[PDB]
């Protein structure tokens, strides 16, 4: 309920026009302020994921339900732990060292496989964004 | 120092949002 | 730090909308407006002048890096969470008194009320999360 | 793909923070 | 409000986020 | 990757924040 007041302030960032719903281009303008430039197609499937009624827009109750899914920077902290040289990439060498510290008796193949599980761009290392993708994956 | 903080306030919220919408 | 200048160029680009190299007073205004705040040209000017090392009116990348070096915003949310026991979003003089007593502070009722009315801007009698970072800065 | 959206959103919290305090 | 109280409350939370992470 | 590694990594940072905050 105090939480609803905070979520109404949060919805207002997305709902520039204040009509009660978050359109696809409203998701686009906010994404663009964060430098991300997705296509109209990408914004549509992003909304469609959290569109219970399928009306194309996300209303305040739908938005509330999504926030209730579920601290969002805990991953930032974990990544900083794994990325030892602070270069922003988790090498398989760094992961191996971190697993050994936590007592994981993981072989060289298991470590390389973990790198390949989270390496989307295929650079051989897991950057922050790749780590956040793996941490926030249901 | 009022408007100043209210900015850093809303950002904390925008990232909790683009997190859930985005994932 | 050498690979950190990367993450600050991504942060700087967000404000330098035109990419001329400097964040003008109106470019900060547009980022602030995207965050719901609609500050005045005067409020934006004193905000830049604070982190304007040369006083030319705009922040080039080197001044921006210098400003970012100074300091702890997400750890403040944790501290507020510690003071606010009942989770109502407001720190009562009672909540502050108990947290001070727990930490070994021999603070009298007046010292505690003075800390409350010190961070009390809207006169809510309580130290809101906002009101708390306003004094934390 | 989109977690880079919250990375930037994460960085903007810090930049805003010291652009005034 | 003074540094000792602000950093002490943060240290308590730190101990808290420690026992919580240690749960899993 | 294993919840064991992800939560352990967060617990290390918390011990860190703990020591650093204890320093005041
Ligand atoms: Ca709308
Ligand atoms: Ca809907
Ligand atoms: Ca590395
Ligand atoms: Ca990669
Ligand atoms: Ca500019
Ligand atoms: Ca300059």
Residue numbers in the entry:
A (entry chain A): 6 to 75, 81 to 148
B (entry chain N): 459 to 481
C (entry chain C): 5 to 75, 81 to 146
D (entry chain Q): 458 to 478
E (entry chain c), F (entry chain a): 458 to 481
From the paper:
The adenylate cyclase (CyaA) toxin is a major virulence factor produced by Bordetella pertussis, the causative agent of whooping cough, and is involved in the early stages of respiratory tract colonization. Once secreted by B. pertussis, CyaA invades eukaryotic cells through an original molecular mechanism that involves a direct translocation of its N‐terminal adenyl cyclase catalytic (AC) domain across the plasma membrane. We have previously shown that a peptide, corresponding to the C‐terminus of the translocation region TR of CyaA, P454 (residues 454–484), exhibits membrane‐active properties related to antimicrobial peptides (AMPs): this peptide adopts a helical conformation upon membrane interaction and induces a local destabilization of the lipid bilayer. Here, we show that P454 is able to translocate across a lipid bilayer and binds with high affinity to calcium‐loaded calmodulin (holo‐CaM).
